[PDB]
Design a protein around this ligand. Structure first.
Ligand SMILES: *[C@@H]1O[C@H](CO)[C@@H](O[C@@H]2O[C@H](CO)[C@@H](O[C@@H]3O[C@H](CO)[C@@H](O)[C@H](O[C@H]4O[C@H](CO)[C@@H](O)[C@H](O)[C@@H]4O)[C@@H]3O)[C@H](O)[C@H]2NC(C)=O)[C@H](O)[C@H]1NC(C)=O
Ligand SMILES: *[C@@H]1O[C@H](CO)[C@@H](O[C@@H]2O[C@H](CO)[C@@H](O[C@@H]3O[C@H](CO)[C@@H](O)[C@H](O)[C@@H]3O)[C@H](O)[C@H]2NC(C)=O)[C@H](O)[C@H]1NC(C)=O
Ligand SMILES: *[C@@H]1O[C@H](CO)[C@@H](O)[C@H](O)[C@H]1NC(C)=O
Ligand SMILES: *[C@@H]1O[C@H](CO)[C@@H](O)[C@H](O)[C@H]1NC(C)=O
Ligand SMILES: *[C@@H]1O[C@H](CO)[C@@H](O)[C@H](O)[C@H]1NC(C)=O
Ligand SMILES: *[C@@H]1O[C@H](CO)[C@@H](O)[C@H](O)[C@H]1NC(C)=O
Ligand SMILES: *[C@@H]1O[C@H](CO)[C@@H](O)[C@H](O)[C@H]1NC(C)=O
Ligand SMILES: *[C@@H]1O[C@H](CO)[C@@H](O)[C@H](O)[C@H]1NC(C)=O
Ligand SMILES: *[C@@H]1O[C@H](CO)[C@@H](O)[C@H](O)[C@H]1NC(C)=O
Ligand SMILES: *[C@@H]1O[C@H](CO)[C@@H](O)[C@H](O)[C@H]1NC(C)=O
Ligand SMILES: *[C@@H]1O[C@H](CO)[C@@H](O)[C@H](O)[C@H]1NC(C)=O
Ligand SMILES: *[C@@H]1O[C@H](CO)[C@@H](O)[C@H](O)[C@H]1NC(C)=O
Ligand SMILES: *[C@@H]1O[C@H](CO)[C@@H](O)[C@H](O)[C@H]1NC(C)=O
Lengths: 130, 119, 547, 98, 49
């Protein structure tokens, strides 16, 4: 039972900034690395970014529209995944999801970096810009 | 030590006027409110008014407005009550009272000896 | 599982009483209300609006008002200290009426007075108001405050004009202010902000009607510690001003004589024109509309079928029964029986003229054995001011009357400044906190839950700065003994006991603010301070670092 | 606004006396005792708290607007006249006799 | 005491048992108050009853 209660964000002008938090309890936050994704309301899920494993670089990789816009951080001491989203545009909206990324690879069909999967997600947190 | 030394005891006829006094002691007279209470046998105890020194502000009970006056001497620390026109109904013992903790006036911990007035 | 972690800079504040320093704007250093020692003010005060947070205010019990009252009295006495003593003025005055030359407020009051040399006396003709002069026992009088107290002359150049005075808290303290427009003095305030200095508060002295000051924003606001209590004064704040002009028609020429080495007694020489009478004007329609608004608000606290009756003050000395104020250096006392004369049943361009008397012997903040002589001001005086508040008192004492009578009442002078400091509450800052965490070695975001806040994050002035320094070192001293020489965050080696209110760490850092957490572990705090003491650091630093 | 239990209550020494005062308005309620030929005393204040110097026998309160004063084990110094104050009001006044 | 044998040096004696001493002024003084100036008042023994 990996509860992922993500709670943050709300109404904001087209230009602005805000600060979403994604709690997590019931697994090993200390090395397993996590991802954010965005699902605008009239749209499906779209990938945002993901912290890398502590010891696996501890870096972040943004997405094609989001690069230069968002920033991801983790305070593993308190099991919290923060996402700062700044310099906002109007398409930025939806039930922003935080999930626990995984590492998957195998030989035979091996190819770097392989693939990852989003097993345990959160419930959701609505953010809408105006 | 808080002591309200009350003084009076004068027999009066109807239609005349009366005055009684209440000297404060122990506590600083200036920074604490005084009240005047009347007790008649077989009747409700009626609160007659209150007097705040440091300005001498007065609040008279509505039934007695126009007939009761309360003043004070700051230097002798003495409050004075006066009634302009007594009647038979004014037969009662009058008390000069102080709140237990003036912050809240309506706890009459300290009472005077009592001044009977017969009409 | 969980370990005590020491966070410094947590946004947790606790109420408190402290010292506060004046901070004026620019300053002729002749203002009675200027100490010529108040630090310059901030041109851009750092007013920080908070996130969602409710703060329980109580304007009736804060120490800002008591401290301001003490400061005002001390400042006035300081101003009056280096001025003439008027000891030899208490003499037998032989007074005659100021007549029409053919046909009793003013009195001539000739008298003998001392001069530069003690071997000589001079005969001086003056003019004193009837209020200042009391008859002895052959038309012989004296000044009213001679058989008690001693009258001190105000220095002629000292001006009594109110000046804005900001009150600033020392470092380590802050001043929360409630911005809720309908706030009525007590209870929760959802809209809280923080400042270092209050806005400029004019020390305006008035008794029945509060002048100038600050107005309500939306509607007339009624404040009382208990509206049903007959002893607590009701403070009314107006959302619009009612202009109150006032004048002293008399063309009054002042003359001065020397009464001793380096001392001069200023007194009214004479009057050129007709004597006339001092008076004030209040717009009739505006005052009637204001009373209508006050009745509309008062009907909410009481029954909606109650007849609200306004009457004159029922008694007291001249400061309470009459609207007492300062104008151009003179002291007016106006009847105001024409303003509160009405009954209001539960469903143009005329001016109400209030007679006013002038008193030179003044006793403000009524004290046993002290008084002032306000010297007369030459020429005609006019003022223009805003009535922005009232002080009312209920009569009570009847159950079947069905009508509530509201009379003006001066009450206490502190009631003036309660109408100005109702917004503010002083809070001590306690930046230190402890929390459970899985590591073993400004006031913004107070309303934001923990975790998000973690990454998001004259003589009075001297005592004030010194205290802060001590407090600063105190925190550092704690950080010294906890093996945390750094700042902000440090992990420590004391495990979290389950008995210390445990939510399992998923909720405390998501759902709960720093203030709530402090409330949760306040009673237990000295225990963790005990365990985080150098008892742990003796095991960690003395036993293990002697190679 | 204020009413009380019967004013001719008569008990011997030793029993428990129940004095009921009903109040219409909100406010702190105090209980006063008057001895014969002496000024009244504050017996209860703020509804339930005893005044200084009052024994523990005088106690009692009620959440609702019907306050009850309980006087257990009456002595010779009791058996005065009891009043119930709420702000200005005092009520009818009930005597306790033998 | 400081050096004991030294004169010119007070010897402080502290008792284990207190000695009760009681004083009185048996005069029923009637005290009057008179004003000497503005505010200032002078208190003197008026009479002896
Ligand atoms: C509420 O605020 C109002 C508005 O500020 C305030 O009215 C103002 O009062 C002051 C003080 O009386 C007035 O300033 C005076 O105005 C005239 C201008 O001709 C001068 O006579 C005065 O200067 C003389 O006095 C000074 C000492 O105070 C001396 O230094 C000087 O040399 C002169 O002898 C003085 O400047 C001001 O004009 C009014 N404002 C208006 C708009 O009329 C009012 O007093 C405040 N309320 C209360 C209760 O005080
Ligand atoms: C005037 O003074 C009173 C007492 O000092 C202030 O508080 C009031 O106190 C009474 C109890 O004495 C409260 O009664 C409460 O009522 C409800 C009943 O459902 C319930 O919540 C409680 O159990 C309790 O019995 C009363 O509510 C309380 N008044 C308020 C407004 O909270 C009173 O507030 C003062 N009046 C004012 C400010 O207008
Ligand atoms: C002053 O006027 C009063 C009131 O009319 C009068 O009684 C008094 O005698 C007058 N004084 C003198 C000295 O004429
Ligand atoms: C006061 O008396 C003197 C006596 O010389 C006189 O000159 C002066 O005019 C009088 N004042 C008034 C206002 O009448
Ligand atoms: C002033 O003193 C002189 C001394 O001769 C005396 O005659 C006169 O009456 C005194 N005047 C007053 C007004 O007291
Ligand atoms: C003397 O002072 C007292 C107060 O100490 C005051 O009541 C009295 O009125 C004064 N005397 C006269 C004659 O006014
Ligand atoms: C006014 O005071 C009452 C208690 O008397 C309180 O419940 C109320 O919240 C206050 N009004 C506001 C707007 O806070
Ligand atoms: C006060 O006087 C000004 C002119 O100085 C005038 O415009 C205003 O109407 C007056 N106020 C009242 C209430 O009459
Ligand atoms: C004030 O207005 C009320 C209605 O609000 C009216 O009945 C009353 O006559 C007015 N009073 C004056 C003095 O104009
Ligand atoms: C105000 O005028 C009324 C008119 O009846 C009068 O009774 C009252 O005494 C006056 N106030 C003062 C303080 O003289
Ligand atoms: C007072 O009267 C004198 C007479 O010379 C005149 O010069 C002066 O202007 C008057 N003052 C005022 C303020 O009208
Ligand atoms: C009265 O209030 C108005 C509105 O706030 C303001 O513009 C005006 O300056 C005030 N009057 C004075 C004399 O301060
Ligand atoms: C105090 O008494 C001791 C013995 O108890 C003695 O040796 C010492 O000299 C005395 N102190 C003096 C004389 O100051």
């Amino acid at each position: 039972e990996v509860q992922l209660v993500e709670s943050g964000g709300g109404l904001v002008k087209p230009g602005g900034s805000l600060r979403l938090s994604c709690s997590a309890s019931g697994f090993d936050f200390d090395n397993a690395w996590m991802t954010w994704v965005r699902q605008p309301p009239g749209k499906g899920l779209e990938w945002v970014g993901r912290i890398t494993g502590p010891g696996e670089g501890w870096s972040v990789d943004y997405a094609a529209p989001v690069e230069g816009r968002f920033t991801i951080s983790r305070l593993n001491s308190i099991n919290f995944l923060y996402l700062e989203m700044n310099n906002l545009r109007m398409e930025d909206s939806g039930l922003y999801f935080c999930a626990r990324t995984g590492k998957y690879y195998d030989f035979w069909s091996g190819y770097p970096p392989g693939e990852e999967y989003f097993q345990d997600w959160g419930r959701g947190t609505l953010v809408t810009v105006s | 030590q808080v002591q309200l030394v009350q003084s009076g005891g004068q027999m009066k006829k109807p239609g005349e006027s009366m005055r009684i006094s209440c000297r404060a002691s122990g506590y600083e007279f200036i920074d604490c409110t005084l009240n005047w209470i009347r007790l008649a046998p077989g009747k409700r105890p009626e609160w007659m008014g209150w007097l705040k020194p440091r300005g001498g502000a007065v609040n008279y009970a509505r039934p007695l407005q126009g007939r009761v006056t309360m003043t004070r001497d700051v230097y002798s620390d003495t409050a004075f009550l006066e009634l302009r026109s007594l009647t038979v109904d004014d037969t009662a013992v009058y008390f000069c009272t102080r709140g237990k903790n003036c912050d809240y006036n309506w706890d009459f911990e300290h009472w005077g000896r009592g001044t009977p007035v017969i009409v | 599982n969980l370990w005590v972690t020491v966070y410094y800079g947590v946004p947790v504040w606790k109420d408190a009483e402290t010292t506060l320093f004046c901070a004026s704007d620019a300053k002729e250093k002749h203002n009675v209300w200027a100490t010529h020692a108040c630090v310059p003010t901030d041109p851009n005060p750092q007013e920080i609006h908070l996130e969602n947070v409710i703060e329980e205010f109580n304007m009736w019990k804060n120490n800002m008002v008591e401290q301001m009252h003490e400061d005002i009295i001390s400042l006035w006495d300081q101003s009056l200290k280096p001025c003439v003593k008027l000891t030899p003025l208490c003499v037998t005055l032989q007074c005659t009426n100021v007549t029409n030359n053919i046909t009793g407020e003013l009195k001539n009051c000739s008298f003998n007075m001392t001069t530069e040399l003690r071997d000589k006396k001079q005969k001086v003709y003056s003019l004193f108001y009837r209020l200042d002069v009391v008859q002895i026992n052959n038309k012989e009088y004296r000044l009213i405050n001679c058989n008690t107290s001693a009258i001190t002359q105000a220095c002629p150049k000292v001006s009594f004009e109110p000046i804005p005075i900001h009150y600033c808290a020392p470092a380590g303290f802050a001043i929360l202010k409630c911005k809720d427009k309908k706030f009525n003095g007590t209870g929760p305030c959802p809209s809280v902000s923080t400042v270092q200095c209050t806005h400029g508060i004019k020390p305006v002295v008035s008794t029945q009607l509060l002048l100038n000051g600050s107005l309500a924003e939306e509607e007339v606001i009624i404040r009382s510690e208990n509206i049903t209590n007959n002893a607590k004064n009701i403070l009314v704040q107006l959302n619009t001003p009612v202009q109150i002009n006032c004048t002293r028609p008399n063309n009054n020429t002042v003359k001065s004589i020397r009464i001793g080495p380096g001392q001069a007694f200023y007194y009214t020489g004479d009057i050129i024109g007709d004597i006339r009478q001092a008076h004030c004007n209040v717009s009739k329609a505006t005052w009637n509309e204001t009373l209508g608004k006050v009745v509309k608000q008062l009907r909410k606290h009481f029954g909606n079928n109650t007849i609200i009756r306004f009457a004159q003050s029922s008694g007291g000395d001249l400061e309470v029964t009459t609207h007492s104020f300062n104008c151009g250096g003179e002291f007016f006392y106006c009847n105001t029986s024409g303003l509160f004369n009405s009954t209001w049943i539960s469903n143009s361009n005329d001016s109400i003229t209030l007679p006013c008397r002038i008193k030179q012997i003044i006793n403000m903040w009524q004290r046993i054995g002290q008084a002032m002589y306000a010297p007369p001001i030459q020429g005609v005086i006019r003022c223009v001011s805003n009535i922005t508040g009232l002080i009312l008192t209920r009569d009570g004492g009847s159950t079947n009357s069905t009508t509530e009578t509201f009379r003006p009442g001066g009450g206490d002078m502190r009631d003036n400044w309660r109408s100005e400091l109702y917004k503010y509450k002083v809070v001590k800052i306690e930046p230190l906190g402890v929390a459970p965490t899985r590591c073993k070695r400004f006031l913004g975001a107070a309303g934001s839950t923990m975790g998000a806040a973690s990454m998001t994050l004259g003589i009075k002035q001297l005592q004030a700065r010194v205290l802060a320094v001590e407090h600063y070192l105190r925190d550092q001293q704690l950080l010294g003994i906890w093996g945390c020489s750094g700042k902000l965050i440090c992990c420590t080696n004391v495990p979290w006991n389950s008995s210390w209110s445990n939510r399992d760490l998923s909720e405390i850092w998501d759902k709960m603010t720093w203030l709530q957490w402090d409330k949760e572990i306040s009673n237990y705090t000295q225990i963790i301070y005990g365990l985080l003491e150098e008892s742990q650091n003796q095991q960690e630093k003395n036993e293990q670092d002697l190679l | 606004v204020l009413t009380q239990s019967p004013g001719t209550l008569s008990l011997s020494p030793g029993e428990t006396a129940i004095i009921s005062c009903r109040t219409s308005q909100y406010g702190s309620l105090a209980w006063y005792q008057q001895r014969p030929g002496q000024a009244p005393r504050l017996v209860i204040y703020s509804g339930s708290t005893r005044a200084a110097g009052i024994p523990d026998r005088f106690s009692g309160s009620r959440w609702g607007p019907d306050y009850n004063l309980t006087i257990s084990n009456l002595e010779s110094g009791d058996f005065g006249v009891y009043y119930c104050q709420q702000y200005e009001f005092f009520g009818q006044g009930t005597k306790v006799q033998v």
